[PDB]
Protein backbone atom coordinates (compact mmCIF):
# COMPACT_ATOMS: atom_id res chain seq x y z
CA UNK A 1 0.00 0.00 0.00
CA UNK A 2 1.55 3.26 -1.23
CA UNK A 3 -0.09 6.69 -1.14
CA UNK A 4 1.15 8.96 -3.90
CA UNK A 5 1.35 12.75 -4.20
CA UNK A 6 1.52 14.21 -7.73
CA UNK A 7 3.30 17.37 -6.45
CA UNK A 8 6.07 17.56 -3.83
CA UNK A 9 5.65 21.30 -3.32
CA UNK A 10 2.93 23.94 -3.80
CA UNK A 11 3.72 27.66 -4.15
CA UNK A 12 0.52 29.65 -3.68
CA UNK A 13 -0.50 33.32 -3.78
CA UNK A 14 -1.81 35.10 -0.69
CA UNK A 15 -5.59 35.09 -0.54
CA UNK A 16 -5.99 32.39 -3.18
CA UNK A 17 -7.72 29.02 -2.97
CA UNK A 18 -5.68 25.82 -3.26
CA UNK A 19 -6.33 22.08 -3.55
CA UNK A 20 -3.59 19.60 -2.63
CA UNK A 21 -3.87 16.02 -3.86
CA UNK A 22 -3.44 12.57 -2.34
CA UNK A 23 -3.83 9.45 -4.46
CA UNK A 24 -4.47 6.06 -2.90
CA UNK A 25 -5.28 2.87 -4.83
CA UNK A 26 -8.90 1.81 -4.94
CA UNK A 27 -10.10 -1.35 -6.59
CA UNK A 28 -13.28 -0.76 -8.33
CA UNK A 29 -15.71 0.63 -5.81
CA UNK A 30 -14.71 2.54 -2.75
CA UNK A 31 -15.45 0.66 0.47
CA UNK A 32 -16.19 3.76 2.52
CA UNK A 33 -16.36 1.95 5.87
CA UNK A 34 -12.73 0.84 5.40
CA UNK A 35 -11.43 4.32 4.48
CA UNK A 36 -9.54 6.43 7.04
CA UNK A 37 -8.12 9.84 6.07
CA UNK A 38 -6.35 12.50 8.15
CA UNK A 39 -5.03 15.85 6.91
CA UNK A 40 -2.76 17.53 9.45
CA UNK A 41 0.28 19.63 9.88
CA UNK A 42 2.65 19.07 12.77
CA UNK A 43 0.50 19.56 15.72
CA UNK A 44 -2.80 20.49 14.07
CA UNK A 45 -5.72 18.47 12.71
CA UNK A 46 -7.26 19.77 9.49
CA UNK A 47 -9.46 16.81 8.49
CA UNK A 48 -10.49 13.72 10.46
CA UNK A 49 -12.22 11.05 8.38
CA UNK A 50 -12.35 7.62 10.03
CA UNK A 51 -14.29 4.60 8.74
CA UNK A 52 -16.48 6.61 6.40
CA UNK A 53 -17.66 9.46 8.66
CA UNK A 54 -15.99 12.81 9.33
CA UNK A 55 -15.56 14.50 12.72
CA UNK A 56 -14.68 18.21 12.44
CA UNK A 57 -14.91 18.79 16.22
CA UNK A 58 -11.27 17.65 16.03
CA UNK A 59 -10.28 20.33 13.49
CA UNK A 60 -7.85 23.03 14.62
CA UNK A 61 -8.77 26.72 14.91
CA UNK A 62 -6.47 27.88 12.08
CA UNK A 63 -8.47 26.04 9.43
CA UNK A 64 -12.00 26.52 10.75
CA UNK A 65 -14.62 26.57 7.96
CA UNK A 66 -11.72 27.23 5.55
CA UNK A 67 -10.33 23.79 4.80
CA UNK A 68 -12.49 20.84 3.83
CA UNK A 69 -12.23 17.46 2.14
CA UNK A 70 -14.08 16.82 -1.14
CA UNK A 71 -16.14 13.63 -0.74
CA UNK A 72 -17.31 12.62 -4.20
CA UNK A 73 -13.69 12.49 -5.29
CA UNK A 74 -12.95 9.88 -2.60
CA UNK A 75 -14.48 7.39 -5.04
CA UNK A 76 -11.65 8.06 -7.50
CA UNK A 77 -8.91 7.21 -5.00
CA UNK A 78 -8.37 10.96 -4.59
CA UNK A 79 -8.19 12.62 -1.16
CA UNK A 80 -8.08 16.36 -1.89
CA UNK A 81 -7.76 19.04 0.80
CA UNK A 82 -9.24 22.43 -0.14
CA UNK A 83 -7.78 25.47 1.64
CA UNK A 84 -9.60 28.75 1.07
CA UNK A 85 -8.08 32.23 1.34
CA UNK A 86 -4.47 31.21 1.88
CA UNK A 87 -2.25 33.24 4.21
CA UNK A 88 1.34 33.12 5.48
CA UNK A 89 0.34 31.08 8.54
CA UNK A 90 -0.86 28.22 6.30
CA UNK A 91 2.76 27.82 5.11
CA UNK A 92 4.38 24.68 6.44
CA UNK A 93 4.69 20.95 5.94
CA UNK A 94 1.37 19.23 5.38
CA UNK A 95 0.72 15.53 5.74
CA UNK A 96 -1.84 13.11 4.37
CA UNK A 97 -2.62 9.93 6.28
CA UNK A 98 -4.74 7.28 4.58
CA UNK A 99 -5.67 3.79 5.77
CA UNK A 100 -7.60 1.60 3.33
CA UNK A 101 -6.53 -1.96 3.86
CA UNK A 102 -2.92 -1.01 4.39
CA UNK A 103 -1.91 2.50 5.35
CA UNK A 104 0.68 5.08 4.31
CA UNK A 105 1.43 8.79 4.69
CA UNK A 106 3.02 11.49 2.54
CA UNK A 107 4.27 15.02 3.25
CA UNK A 108 3.88 18.16 1.11
CA UNK A 109 5.67 21.49 1.67
CA UNK A 110 3.76 24.72 1.03
CA UNK A 111 5.02 28.25 0.39
CA UNK A 112 2.68 31.29 0.28
CA UNK A 113 3.52 34.38 -1.81
CA UNK A 114 3.81 37.73 -0.12
CA UNK A 115 0.94 40.08 -1.06
CA UNK A 116 1.31 41.75 -4.48
Amino acid sequence: FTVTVPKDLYVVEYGSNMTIECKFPVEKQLDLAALIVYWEMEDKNIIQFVHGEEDLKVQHSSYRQRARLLKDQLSLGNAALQITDVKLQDAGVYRCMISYGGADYKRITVKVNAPY
Epitope: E40, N45, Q48, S99, G101, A103
Partner: antibody, heavy 117, light 108 residues
Framework: GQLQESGPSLVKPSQTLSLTCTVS????????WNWIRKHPGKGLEYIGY???????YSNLSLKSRVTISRDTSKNQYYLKLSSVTAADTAVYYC????????????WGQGTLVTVSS | DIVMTQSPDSLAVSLGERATINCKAS??????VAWFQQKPGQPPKALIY???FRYSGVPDRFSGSGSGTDFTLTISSLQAEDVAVYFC?????????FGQGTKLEIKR
Protein backbone atom coordinates in the same frame (compact mmCIF):
# COMPACT_ATOMS: atom_id res chain seq x y z
CA GLY B 1 7.47 6.58 30.56
CA GLN B 2 4.85 5.14 32.87
CA LEU B 3 1.11 4.72 32.33
CA GLN B 4 -1.44 4.16 35.09
CA GLU B 5 -5.10 3.38 34.44
CA SER B 6 -7.86 4.19 36.91
CA GLY B 7 -11.61 4.13 37.33
CA PRO B 8 -14.46 1.88 38.44
CA SER B 9 -14.04 -1.88 38.60
CA LEU B 10 -17.80 -2.38 38.21
CA VAL B 11 -20.36 -0.81 35.86
CA LYS B 12 -23.99 -1.83 35.47
CA PRO B 13 -25.21 -2.89 32.01
CA SER B 14 -26.52 -0.17 29.66
CA GLN B 15 -24.41 2.48 31.42
CA THR B 16 -21.18 4.11 30.18
CA LEU B 17 -17.77 2.77 31.16
CA SER B 18 -15.41 5.65 32.00
CA LEU B 19 -11.68 5.15 32.50
CA THR B 20 -8.67 7.42 32.93
CA CYS B 21 -4.99 6.92 32.10
CA THR B 22 -2.39 9.00 33.94
CA VAL B 23 0.68 9.51 31.75
CA SER B 24 4.14 10.25 33.18
CA UNK B 25 7.82 10.02 32.26
CA UNK B 26 8.88 10.00 28.61
CA UNK B 27 5.33 8.94 27.47
CA UNK B 28 4.00 12.53 27.99
CA UNK B 29 5.46 13.54 24.63
CA UNK B 30 4.87 10.30 22.71
CA UNK B 31 2.65 11.00 19.75
CA UNK B 32 -0.18 8.48 20.12
CA TRP B 33 -2.00 7.45 23.31
CA ASN B 34 -3.90 4.19 22.77
CA TRP B 35 -6.50 2.09 24.55
CA ILE B 36 -6.52 -1.71 24.32
CA ARG B 37 -8.73 -4.26 26.06
CA LYS B 38 -8.76 -8.03 26.49
CA HIS B 39 -12.03 -9.88 26.95
CA PRO B 40 -11.61 -13.19 28.83
CA GLY B 41 -11.18 -16.08 26.42
CA LYS B 42 -10.63 -13.68 23.52
CA GLY B 43 -7.71 -12.02 21.79
CA LEU B 44 -6.61 -8.47 22.46
CA GLU B 45 -8.85 -5.88 20.80
CA TYR B 46 -7.40 -2.54 19.70
CA ILE B 47 -9.82 0.21 20.74
CA GLY B 48 -8.26 3.40 19.38
CA TYR B 49 -6.03 6.34 20.17
CA UNK B 50 -5.78 10.07 20.66
CA UNK B 51 -2.84 11.91 19.10
CA UNK B 52 -0.72 14.90 20.09
CA UNK B 53 -2.73 16.76 17.43
CA UNK B 54 -5.96 16.03 19.30
CA UNK B 55 -7.07 13.64 16.56
CA UNK B 56 -8.82 10.42 17.55
CA TYR B 57 -9.28 6.98 16.06
CA SER B 58 -11.70 4.26 17.16
CA ASN B 59 -12.12 0.68 15.98
CA LEU B 60 -15.13 0.28 13.68
CA SER B 61 -16.18 -2.66 15.88
CA LEU B 62 -16.68 -0.10 18.67
CA LYS B 63 -16.79 3.38 17.00
CA SER B 64 -20.49 3.84 17.76
CA ARG B 65 -20.09 3.59 21.54
CA VAL B 66 -16.56 4.93 22.15
CA THR B 67 -15.35 8.44 22.98
CA ILE B 68 -11.65 9.15 23.53
CA SER B 69 -10.56 12.52 24.89
CA ARG B 70 -7.65 14.12 26.71
CA ASP B 71 -6.65 16.86 29.14
CA THR B 72 -3.02 17.88 28.72
CA SER B 73 -3.27 20.28 31.67
CA LYS B 74 -3.42 17.20 33.93
CA ASN B 75 -1.44 14.76 31.75
CA GLN B 76 -4.43 12.45 31.29
CA TYR B 77 -6.49 10.88 28.56
CA TYR B 78 -9.82 9.14 28.96
CA LEU B 79 -12.03 6.42 27.51
CA LYS B 80 -15.83 6.40 27.58
CA LEU B 81 -17.70 3.32 26.33
CA SER B 82 -21.48 3.60 26.35
CA SER B 83 -24.27 1.00 26.52
CA VAL B 84 -21.92 -1.63 27.96
CA THR B 85 -22.87 -5.32 28.06
CA ALA B 86 -21.28 -8.48 29.43
CA ALA B 87 -19.18 -8.57 26.25
CA ASP B 88 -17.39 -5.43 27.50
CA THR B 89 -15.99 -7.12 30.61
CA ALA B 90 -12.27 -6.86 29.93
CA VAL B 91 -8.86 -5.85 31.20
CA TYR B 92 -8.43 -2.35 29.77
CA TYR B 93 -4.90 -1.24 28.89
CA CYS B 94 -3.64 2.22 28.14
CA UNK B 95 -0.54 2.30 25.98
CA UNK B 96 1.66 4.50 23.80
CA UNK B 97 3.22 4.38 20.34
CA UNK B 98 5.80 6.70 18.81
CA UNK B 99 4.18 7.22 15.40
CA UNK B 100 1.04 6.69 13.36
CA UNK B 101 2.45 3.46 11.86
CA UNK B 102 4.46 2.05 14.76
CA UNK B 103 3.77 -0.78 17.23
CA UNK B 104 2.14 -0.22 20.60
CA UNK B 105 5.43 -0.47 22.48
CA UNK B 106 4.76 0.61 26.09
CA TRP B 107 1.86 -0.82 28.09
CA GLY B 108 0.23 -0.02 31.40
CA GLN B 109 -0.58 -2.71 33.93
CA GLY B 110 -4.21 -2.73 32.79
CA THR B 111 -7.30 -2.65 35.00
CA LEU B 112 -10.16 -5.13 35.11
CA VAL B 113 -13.67 -3.74 34.56
CA THR B 114 -16.63 -6.06 35.14
CA VAL B 115 -20.10 -5.31 33.79
CA SER B 116 -22.72 -6.75 36.13
CA SER B 117 -25.95 -5.96 37.98
CA ASP C 1 -9.54 -6.04 9.42
CA ILE C 2 -6.23 -7.83 8.90
CA VAL C 3 -6.63 -10.99 10.98
CA MET C 4 -3.46 -12.27 12.66
CA THR C 5 -3.67 -16.02 13.29
CA GLN C 6 -1.10 -17.41 15.74
CA SER C 7 -0.01 -21.04 15.98
CA PRO C 8 0.18 -22.91 18.18
CA ASP C 9 -2.23 -21.95 20.93
CA SER C 10 0.21 -23.45 23.45
CA LEU C 11 3.58 -25.15 23.45
CA ALA C 12 5.72 -27.02 25.98
CA VAL C 13 9.51 -26.85 25.58
CA SER C 14 12.38 -28.09 27.73
CA LEU C 15 14.97 -25.70 29.12
CA GLY C 16 17.91 -24.89 26.88
CA GLU C 17 15.94 -25.93 23.79
CA ARG C 18 14.19 -23.90 21.09
CA ALA C 19 10.56 -22.76 20.82
CA THR C 20 8.90 -21.58 17.60
CA ILE C 21 5.83 -19.31 17.54
CA ASN C 22 4.17 -18.49 14.22
CA CYS C 23 1.88 -15.59 13.37
CA LYS C 24 0.10 -15.52 10.01
CA ALA C 25 -1.49 -12.42 8.47
CA SER C 26 -4.55 -12.58 6.24
CA UNK C 27 -2.95 -10.15 3.75
CA UNK C 28 0.43 -8.61 2.95
CA UNK C 29 1.76 -6.58 5.92
CA UNK C 30 5.10 -6.59 4.53
CA UNK C 31 7.16 -6.17 7.71
CA UNK C 32 4.92 -4.12 10.04
CA VAL C 33 4.80 -6.82 12.71
CA ALA C 34 5.81 -6.67 16.37
CA TRP C 35 6.26 -9.38 18.99
CA PHE C 36 5.42 -9.09 22.68
CA GLN C 37 5.95 -11.04 25.90
CA GLN C 38 3.44 -10.96 28.77
CA LYS C 39 4.48 -12.70 31.99
CA PRO C 40 1.66 -13.39 34.49
CA GLY C 41 0.26 -10.31 36.20
CA GLN C 42 2.59 -8.06 34.19
CA PRO C 43 1.97 -5.70 31.26
CA PRO C 44 3.03 -6.75 27.75
CA LYS C 45 6.70 -6.19 26.95
CA ALA C 46 7.89 -5.27 23.46
CA LEU C 47 10.36 -7.80 22.03
CA ILE C 48 10.64 -7.20 18.26
CA TYR C 49 9.45 -4.58 15.77
CA UNK C 50 9.70 -4.47 11.96
CA UNK C 51 9.51 -8.27 12.33
CA UNK C 52 13.15 -9.18 12.85
CA PHE C 53 14.82 -6.46 14.89
CA ARG C 54 15.05 -6.48 18.71
CA TYR C 55 14.19 -3.66 21.11
CA SER C 56 16.89 -2.33 23.41
CA GLY C 57 17.62 -4.69 26.30
CA VAL C 58 15.82 -7.72 24.83
CA PRO C 59 18.24 -10.68 25.11
CA ASP C 60 19.95 -12.17 22.07
CA ARG C 61 18.06 -15.49 22.10
CA PHE C 62 14.81 -13.76 21.03
CA SER C 63 14.89 -13.63 17.23
CA GLY C 64 12.10 -12.56 14.90
CA SER C 65 11.79 -13.35 11.21
CA GLY C 66 9.47 -13.55 8.23
CA SER C 67 7.98 -11.16 5.69
CA GLY C 68 4.81 -10.88 3.67
CA THR C 69 2.22 -12.94 5.54
CA ASP C 70 4.35 -15.49 7.46
CA PHE C 71 6.20 -14.37 10.60
CA THR C 72 7.99 -16.35 13.29
CA LEU C 73 9.42 -15.66 16.74
CA THR C 74 12.23 -18.00 17.80
CA ILE C 75 13.38 -18.34 21.41
CA SER C 76 16.66 -20.27 21.77
CA SER C 77 18.26 -21.60 24.96
CA LEU C 78 14.94 -21.47 26.76
CA GLN C 79 15.07 -20.19 30.33
CA ALA C 80 12.64 -20.79 33.17
CA GLU C 81 11.88 -17.03 33.11
CA ASP C 82 10.59 -17.33 29.60
CA VAL C 83 7.18 -18.56 30.79
CA ALA C 84 4.68 -16.14 29.29
CA VAL C 85 2.01 -15.58 26.68
CA TYR C 86 3.60 -14.39 23.43
CA PHE C 87 1.56 -12.53 20.82
CA CYS C 88 2.01 -10.56 17.61
CA UNK C 89 0.72 -7.21 16.40
CA UNK C 90 0.37 -5.79 12.91
CA UNK C 91 0.69 -2.05 12.35
CA UNK C 92 0.41 -2.20 8.55
CA UNK C 93 -3.12 -0.77 8.55
CA UNK C 94 -5.97 0.28 10.77
CA UNK C 95 -7.36 -1.01 12.97
CA UNK C 96 -4.24 -2.52 14.50
CA UNK C 97 -4.82 -6.17 15.37
CA PHE C 98 -3.13 -8.77 17.55
CA GLY C 99 -2.68 -12.50 17.39
CA GLN C 100 -4.62 -14.27 20.12
CA GLY C 101 -1.41 -15.37 21.78
CA THR C 102 0.67 -18.49 22.40
CA LYS C 103 1.11 -19.81 25.95
CA LEU C 104 4.65 -21.12 26.46
CA GLU C 105 5.05 -23.82 29.13
CA ILE C 106 8.39 -25.16 30.39
CA LYS C 107 8.87 -28.91 30.50
CA ARG C 108 11.09 -30.18 33.31
Amino acid sequence: GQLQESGPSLVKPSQTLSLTCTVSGDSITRGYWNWIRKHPGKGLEYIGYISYTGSTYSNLSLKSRVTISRDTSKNQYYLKLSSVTAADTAVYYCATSTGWLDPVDYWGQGTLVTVSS
Amino acid sequence: DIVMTQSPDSLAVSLGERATINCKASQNVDTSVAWFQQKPGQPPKALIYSASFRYSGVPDRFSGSGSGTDFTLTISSLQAEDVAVYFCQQYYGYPFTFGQGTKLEIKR
